């Protein structure tokens, strides 16, 4: 079972990504294609709500994992696809689907706009992915509406035996570059049920919260 972790640095500089790319250059084995990610928050527009019912809904869009959206609310996850190649053949065959769906963000922001309204949008484009010995590291700069926000690091490994050691090593590597205020997370949404992309989205939410 693969494991993943996410570390977000808030006080980063524009050139910190290059600094961390060069500081790891000795162990860098290869480089792969760039990636992107989107992060929306939707708000509840109804006022007759109970106290225990949350008001937000976080939508995370993964571009490299085959164009998939994940909706998060109160530690509850939902995974939607929008590509014609991800459709289970039964739904196509029986007639439950017309074959060319839409992203759930269009549905939230077009038809249900009287229940949910957008509040923010944080984007990340042209990230870099590096293959190290039994590890893959992805770096990207986060841009909000106002401007630069911070640095995002996501780590993924296939063997879970020595994940903590790798996390500690990367933390130390950030330490020599004097990035001392960083928030990390490797939590799991469900102890018994393990879905990789849902756990990744939950870790993103836990890292990016203010």
């Amino acid at each position: 079972m693969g494991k993943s972790a996410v570390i977000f640095v808030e006080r980063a500089t524009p050139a910190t990504l290059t600094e961390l790319k060069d500081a790891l250059s000795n162990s860098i084995l290869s480089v792969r294609d760039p990636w992107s990610i989107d992060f929306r928050t939707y708000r509840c527009s109804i006022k007759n709500l109970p106290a225990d019912v949350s008001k937000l809904m976080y939508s995370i869009t993964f571009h490299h994992h085959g164009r998939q959206t994940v909706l998060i609310k109160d530690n509850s996850a939902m995974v939607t696809t929008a590509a014609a190649a991800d459709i289970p053949p039964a739904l196509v065959f029986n007639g439950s689907s017309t074959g060319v769906p839409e992203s759930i963000d269009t549905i939230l922001s077009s038809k249900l706009s009287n229940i949910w309204m957008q509040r923010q949008l944080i984007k990340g484009d042209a990230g870099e992915t590096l293959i190290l010995d039994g590890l893959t590291v992805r770096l990207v700069n986060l841009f909000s509406s106002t401007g630069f926000k911070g640095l995002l690091i996501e780590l993924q490994a296939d063997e879970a035996g020595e994940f903590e050691t790798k996390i500690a090593g990367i933390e130390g590597h950030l330490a020599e570059i004097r990035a001392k205020e960083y928030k990390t997370s490797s939590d799991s949404l469900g102890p018994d049920t393990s879905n990789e992309i849902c756990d990744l989205a939950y870790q993103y939410v836990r890292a990016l919260e203010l």
Partner: protein, 259 residues
């Protein structure tokens, strides 16, 4: 889809060049970690030149075996050197290059056994080169007692003693003025040349020096100062120490210097 006769000739030249590159890269990988990331702004001075940078995980950091492949219309040669490269702010900087020990080898002669022998010897060669670089950072002049230098018997024989054709023993000649950082008051007592002998199998460091004049103080017992005088050469003495980490060897030298 090629368009020009010059384009076709260039395509065939590149075909020969990268076919040779692929063959030798496969030869290295079937035994070696190449780097496909490093791009140098200026080709290294030695007709097509290609630079390949290889290393091993257990090597010292930033030290790369650099191969310059020079391909001509009829013949091809390989220049094997040891260099130090770093990456700063998205740029590759050639921190150091060695030219006195360039191995110019014909294409045909390279074989698997030569590859593995080079693999074994290159660790010792790189250790010698990094010691040279460290002494240069200390601004200390030095010279390598290579295999030919040892075979020529120009070095003192007692230093050659115990070196039974072992690659784990390295001898370096140092200048007395350079090792003392310009102390000219000690030039009249000790010879201008000293010898640092390091045994990895014994993990021992010996600093041999030769007295320029025969002082009667040698007759006195200097056993309490950890100084052992050469039986063959009474004017020659040495300081022996045991080391565990090479990175701190500079301190050891100072200790020797202190003594």
């Amino acid at each position: 889809r090629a368009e020009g006769p010059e384009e076709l000739a260039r395509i065939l030249q590149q075909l020969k060049l990268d076919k040779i590159i692929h063959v030798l890269t496969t030869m290295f990988e079937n035994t070696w970690s190449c780097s496909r990331i490093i791009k140098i702004d200026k080709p290294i001075r030695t007709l097509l030149q290609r630079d390949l940078f290889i290393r091993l995980p257990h090597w010292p950091l930033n030290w790369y075996l650099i191969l310059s492949i020079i391909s001509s219309k009829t013949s091809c040669v390989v220049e094997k050197r040891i260099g130090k490269i770093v990456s700063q702010r998205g740029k590759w900087n050639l921190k150091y290059l060695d030219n006195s020990n360039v191995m110019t080898v014909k294409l045909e002669s390279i074989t698997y056994q030569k590859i593995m022998i080079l693999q074994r010897t290159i660790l010792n060669r790189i250790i010698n080169h990094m010691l040279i670089d460290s002494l240069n950072q200390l601004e200390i002049r030095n010279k390598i007692c290579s295999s030919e230098m040892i075979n020529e018997q120009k070095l003192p024989q007692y230093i050659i003693q115990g070196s039974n054709t072992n690659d784990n023993i390295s001898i370096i000649t140092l200048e007395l003025e350079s090792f003392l950082e310009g102390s000219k008051a000690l030039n009249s007592i000790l010879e201008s040349s000293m010898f640092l002998r390091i045994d990895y199998s014994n993990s021992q460091i010996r600093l041999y020096a030769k007295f320029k004049r025969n002082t009667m103080m040698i007759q006195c017992q200097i056993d309490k100062l950890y100084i052992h005088f050469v039986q063959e050469e009474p004017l020659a003495f040495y300081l022996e120490e045991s080391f565990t980490n090479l990175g701190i060897i500079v301190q050891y030298l100072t200790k020797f210097r202190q003594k």
